[PDB]
Amino acid sequence: MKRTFQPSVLKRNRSHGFRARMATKNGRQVLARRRAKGRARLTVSK
Amino acid sequence: MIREERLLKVLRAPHVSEKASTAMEKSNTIVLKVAKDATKAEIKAAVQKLFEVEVEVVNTLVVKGKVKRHGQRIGRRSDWKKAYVTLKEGQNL
Amino acid sequence: AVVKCKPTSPGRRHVVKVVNPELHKGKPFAPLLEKNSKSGGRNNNGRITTRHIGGGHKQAYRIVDFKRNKDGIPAVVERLEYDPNRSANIALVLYKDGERRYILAPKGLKAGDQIQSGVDAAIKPGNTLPMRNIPVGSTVHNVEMKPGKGGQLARSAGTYVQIVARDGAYVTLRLRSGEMRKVEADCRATLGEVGNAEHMLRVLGKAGAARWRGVRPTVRGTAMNPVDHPHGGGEGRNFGKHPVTPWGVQTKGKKTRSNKRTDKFIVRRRS
RNA sequence: GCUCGCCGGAAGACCAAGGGUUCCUGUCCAACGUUAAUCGGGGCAGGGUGAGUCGACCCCUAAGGCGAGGCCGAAAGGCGUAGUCGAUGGGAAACAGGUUAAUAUUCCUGUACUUGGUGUUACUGCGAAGGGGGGACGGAGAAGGCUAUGUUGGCCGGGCGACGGUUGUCCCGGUUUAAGCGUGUAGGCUGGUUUUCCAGGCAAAUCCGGAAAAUCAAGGCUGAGGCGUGAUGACGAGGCACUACGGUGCUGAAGCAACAAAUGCCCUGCUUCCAGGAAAAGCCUCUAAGCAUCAGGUAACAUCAAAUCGUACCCCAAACCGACACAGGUGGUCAGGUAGAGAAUACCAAGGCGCUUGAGAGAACUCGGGUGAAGGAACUAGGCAAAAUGGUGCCGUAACUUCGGGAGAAGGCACGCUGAUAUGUAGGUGAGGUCCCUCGCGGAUGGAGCUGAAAUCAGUCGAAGAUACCAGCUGGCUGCAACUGUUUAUUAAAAACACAGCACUGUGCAAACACGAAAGUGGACGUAUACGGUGUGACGCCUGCCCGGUGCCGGAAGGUUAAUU
RNA sequence: AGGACCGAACCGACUAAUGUUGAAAAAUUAGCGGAUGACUUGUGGCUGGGGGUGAAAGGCCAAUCAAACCGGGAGAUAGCU
Ligand SMILES: [Mg+2]
Ligand SMILES: [Mg+2]
Ligand SMILES: [Mg+2]
Ligand SMILES: [Mg+2]
Ligand SMILES: [Mg+2]
Ligand SMILES: [Mg+2]
Ligand SMILES: [Mg+2]
Ligand SMILES: [Mg+2]
Ligand SMILES: [Mg+2]
Ligand SMILES: [Mg+2]
Ligand SMILES: [Mg+2]
Ligand SMILES: [Mg+2]
Ligand SMILES: [Mg+2]
Ligand SMILES: [Mg+2]
Ligand SMILES: [Mg+2]
Ligand SMILES: [Mg+2]
Ligand SMILES: [Mg+2]
Ligand SMILES: [Mg+2]
Ligand SMILES: [Mg+2]
Ligand SMILES: [Mg+2]
Ligand SMILES: [Mg+2]
Ligand SMILES: [Mg+2]
Ligand SMILES: [Mg+2]
Ligand SMILES: [Mg+2]
Ligand SMILES: [Mg+2]
Ligand SMILES: [Mg+2]
Ligand SMILES: [Mg+2]
Ligand SMILES: [Mg+2]
Ligand SMILES: [Mg+2]
Ligand SMILES: [Mg+2]
Ligand SMILES: [Mg+2]
Ligand SMILES: [Mg+2]
Ligand SMILES: [Mg+2]
Ligand SMILES: [Mg+2]
Ligand SMILES: [Mg+2]
Ligand SMILES: [Mg+2]
Ligand SMILES: [Mg+2]
Ligand SMILES: [Mg+2]
Ligand SMILES: [Mg+2]
Ligand SMILES: [Mg+2]
Ligand SMILES: [Mg+2]
Ligand SMILES: [Mg+2]
Ligand SMILES: [Mg+2]
Ligand SMILES: [Mg+2]
Ligand SMILES: [Mg+2]
Ligand SMILES: [Mg+2]
Ligand SMILES: [Mg+2]
Ligand SMILES: [Mg+2]
Ligand SMILES: [Mg+2]
Ligand SMILES: [Mg+2]
Ligand SMILES: [Mg+2]
Ligand SMILES: [Mg+2]
Ligand SMILES: [Mg+2]
């Protein structure tokens, strides 16, 4: 049966990537929280 | 025209392998490790200057580095650039 | 002409078609075309604002001349054409100077007929004049509401206005609704009725024919649950409330016009 | 290695997406692999991806996003103009053969093509952010011409058979060749050519559009395939020589014709319909400012350049999405033979596999199947399940009907093989020859060869000839819903929802209405034959009485009544 | 011509049996419906939580829905176990 995760790297990047995060105040707050927590990977970008 | 300082950095090493050995004997082609950012024009210039040969054409490719376990920790070797440099017929490097 | 389809399948049995052999079979005049992509009834917030709009055939927009302000230059009708964007047909006209335009096709207009606009045009169908220069009692269409703005009234297939009176700067019009309205006498109108009056005899015949025209299905309020609509609810067919819109306003008689700015121009409401 | 079995519109082959070394080689077997394992998509090491023409990048836009100023908003921000991004679409150009353990339209061999920069020569009105053309567009249908491809004959090479026969109307194999260049064919579309004038194309225009004359009868554009050339080449059944028996070295005959034939190509065509079918650039063309013997444009020649990134491998799967080496899911491309209407079905080809626990035994019971005396729904809530029907042609077919239907109603007959009609028919195709020719990829006649149904007569075998696989059970009365559709992803598919149709009602355009503190946007580039809401639900015959209650509409005298004073 | 007819691909899900610590957190096998259309499918886009979207089942909105998920108010409150 068709499951929920149907991967597309273009959609991944556009939805959750570094530039999408940076485009809004709320996205920049995500990055701030993740930096503060000390995450090795800030975003899905790769 | 490329500066000699640039040309002295672009060629890194000769590449040794059976494919490289056959390339030399059959097609008069040397195989080189080159700087990642080296262009075909820079490779041609550097080979002609530093090895004192006449170059017909340069083909290039990027080799992606292998992922490898050292003990338990995962590591990844660096990518590098390889050049197939075809020499003119009677050059004999 | 109005033709009844033979019942060779249940979806054809009730179809009635309006077939006009005068209409151009070929493609439209390409210099007067533009794209018009569809909305689904969704505004710039992305939300549905008008229900029941979606799909249907793709359509090119034909630029129709509602202003008719190229005065003093005769034009000849080249052909009548189908326009998907409206009920009326349109007519491609060629002005003597070499310009082509589309206009609304009046009743009676055919290829080869001559038309003209301006103060000194003849009182003939398809000619456009200021309503100061049009006799009282005349039937007109494509009537301007403000001088120079272009026709806004009586554009649909088979429609027309009557000039019932002239009083100084204004004429009184009887509209198709039955409303009596004042309009400035400087406003232009085109003589005659809009053509294609058989449009209203068509019978779509089947559900899919409304889908081709980009209408999606209406679900009745009473078929819904209370959270969805005031009429929603009930064990079986129940109602027991005053009919309302989905947003709770009475929908059987309650008047909704509220425009004190334009009230002065309305001589008599449609009633 | 020899047998056997399975797929073969896939269980073969090639991609995209997604993964990311799983690819190839050597080595190891602890763990991983539902067992063992010398094996592995496992561990360890080493190798492997070659591009002017493929793809991305690049140029161009769609939906949509972001948006200088702007408009709007307690703040955050919202919307949007100029713009700028955004492919799933438009935009230059390469083919065949060879080669590695692992890449190849990328390497080599052979033969091509494209764009741009320079420079030479000859001619020359060049120039855009502007104008025009083009690009540039739907569904369905029909037929013709072709090709891919296949079958047969010929030809060449090989064979003479483990058991009766097999020098022949015998058996096996091969019989391949591109882009480009030339030719402009079947066919499609369009009347040309020249002058004069002009309220049009934001200004100009020699361009487009319009008007008017003269003149000519063919002028132009598009176009599959064929043929020539590419190609005295390559490839080649096989044969010969080595072998480090893994695979190399040497040499190579024939290489044609007919017939059949696509869902591919001509075809973005042609016919027809209504629901009326992107944009922008590249491309062609006209001029403005301006340059004005300069720059710049056109043609021929030479030369240089064409970067960068991807290219391994899996890809209906043990490599992707499903915690698994998981009976699930996953877009595109290719499409051999016999039989068949067929991409169904059976059996095979090329190619690929036997599904990573086995060995015995032959109890009950369970699962999936086969057959069954006599009876034949007696079973059961219920013929649930099973059994049955099942093709083609012809004959024949009721109530009722909205005249279409009902209808495949029901029911019945024929059906194999051989011979004859006719040593292979009707039909299809059409060589040679002959005649003409506004002369060629031409027209007429001609019929060789090839292909080939269907029918009738006669015979003949079997229990059975639509023999297998494949493939309607039928009829009668009745409730509900007109109908095709839609629905509770994962216990409800229905009488529920929708529907065409009907009615009431609101709405005069800065429309009602909806989204939004607003600006705005949808409604609609629509305008009462239009748009919104509500109910009813094809069609036929109809749709009675009540305005007291609750609502809505109209009224404006009087009573009562807010802020305010 | 056709929301025409028979029937594969393709889309669906009417019946039954199996399975129910499954091969599978919804399938398999044999039958079944649509199959030129209100059809089906690839890529990209838009609509957001009292909100969307809904041919309307309170359906669907990442194995979650009569108010999603994540963090926070937060050690909510619990005459109850
Ligand atoms: Mg090269
Ligand atoms: Mg419309
Ligand atoms: Mg309705
Ligand atoms: Mg309900
Ligand atoms: Mg309510
Ligand atoms: Mg009741
Ligand atoms: Mg009651
Ligand atoms: Mg088989
Ligand atoms: Mg099959
Ligand atoms: Mg590894
Ligand atoms: Mg391997
Ligand atoms: Mg062991
Ligand atoms: Mg083991
Ligand atoms: Mg390994
Ligand atoms: Mg490359
Ligand atoms: Mg934009
Ligand atoms: Mg700003
Ligand atoms: Mg914006
Ligand atoms: Mg762009
Ligand atoms: Mg693309
Ligand atoms: Mg390979
Ligand atoms: Mg052929
Ligand atoms: Mg087809
Ligand atoms: Mg590959
Ligand atoms: Mg397994
Ligand atoms: Mg699997
Ligand atoms: Mg047994
Ligand atoms: Mg049994
Ligand atoms: Mg049986
Ligand atoms: Mg029995
Ligand atoms: Mg018996
Ligand atoms: Mg009986
Ligand atoms: Mg009984
Ligand atoms: Mg009983
Ligand atoms: Mg049954
Ligand atoms: Mg059965
Ligand atoms: Mg009853
Ligand atoms: Mg029904
Ligand atoms: Mg469904
Ligand atoms: Mg269900
Ligand atoms: Mg508006
Ligand atoms: Mg109803
Ligand atoms: Mg049908
Ligand atoms: Mg049916
Ligand atoms: Mg599928
Ligand atoms: Mg069900
Ligand atoms: Mg099934
Ligand atoms: Mg069917
Ligand atoms: Mg309920
Ligand atoms: Mg869910
Ligand atoms: Mg709540
Ligand atoms: Mg608290
Ligand atoms: Mg607590």
Reconstruct the topology from this structure:
This is part of a larger assembly, with chains A (46 residues), B (93 residues) and C (271 residues).
Chain A lengths: L8 H8 L1 H5 L2 H13 L9
Chain B lengths: L3 H7 E4 L3 H10 L1 E6 L5 H11 L4 E9 L3 E4 L2 E4 L3 E8 L6
Antiparallel strand pairs in B: 1-2, 2-6, 3-6, 4-5
Helix pairs in contact in B: 1-3
Chain C lengths: L1 E3 L11 E3 L14 E3 L24 E3 L12 E7 L8 E6 L4 E5 L9 E2 L12 E3 L8 E3 L1 E2 L6 E3 L7 E7 L2 E5 L5 E5 L3 E4 L15 H6 L53 E3 L3
Antiparallel strand pairs in C: 1-2, 3-4, 5-6, 5-8, 6-7, 9-16, 10-13, 10-16, 11-12, 13-14, 14-15, 15-17
Bound molecules: magnesium ion (53 copies).
One magnesium ion (MG) binds next to loops of chain C.
Chain C binds two RNA strands through strand 12 and helix 1.
> What distance separates the N and C termini of chain C?
34 Å
Number of strands of chain C: 17
Q: Overall 3D geometry of chain C?
A: globular
Query: What is the spatial order of strands in the main beta sheet of chain C?
Result: 9-16-10-13-14-15-17
Provide the CATH topology of chain B. Answer: Alpha-Beta Plaits
* Succession of helices and strands of chain B: HEHEHEEEE
Q: What percentage of the residues of chain C does DSSP assign to strands (E)?
A: 15-25%
Strand proportion of chain B? 35-45%
What ions, cofactors and ligands are bound? magnesium ion
Helix share bin of chain B: 25-40%
Number of helices of chain C: 1
CATH architecture of the largest domain in chain C: Beta Barrel
Kindly provide the radius of gyration of chain C, computed on alpha-carbon positions and rounded to a whole number of angstroms: 22 Å
CATH class of the largest domain in chain C: Mainly Beta
Strand and helix order of chain C: EEEEEEEEEEEEEEEEHE
Number of domains of chain C: 3
PDB class: ribosome
Keywords: decoding, translation, ribosome
Entry title: 70S ribosome with cognate tRNASer3 bound to A-site AGC codon
Chain A: Large ribosomal subunit protein bL34
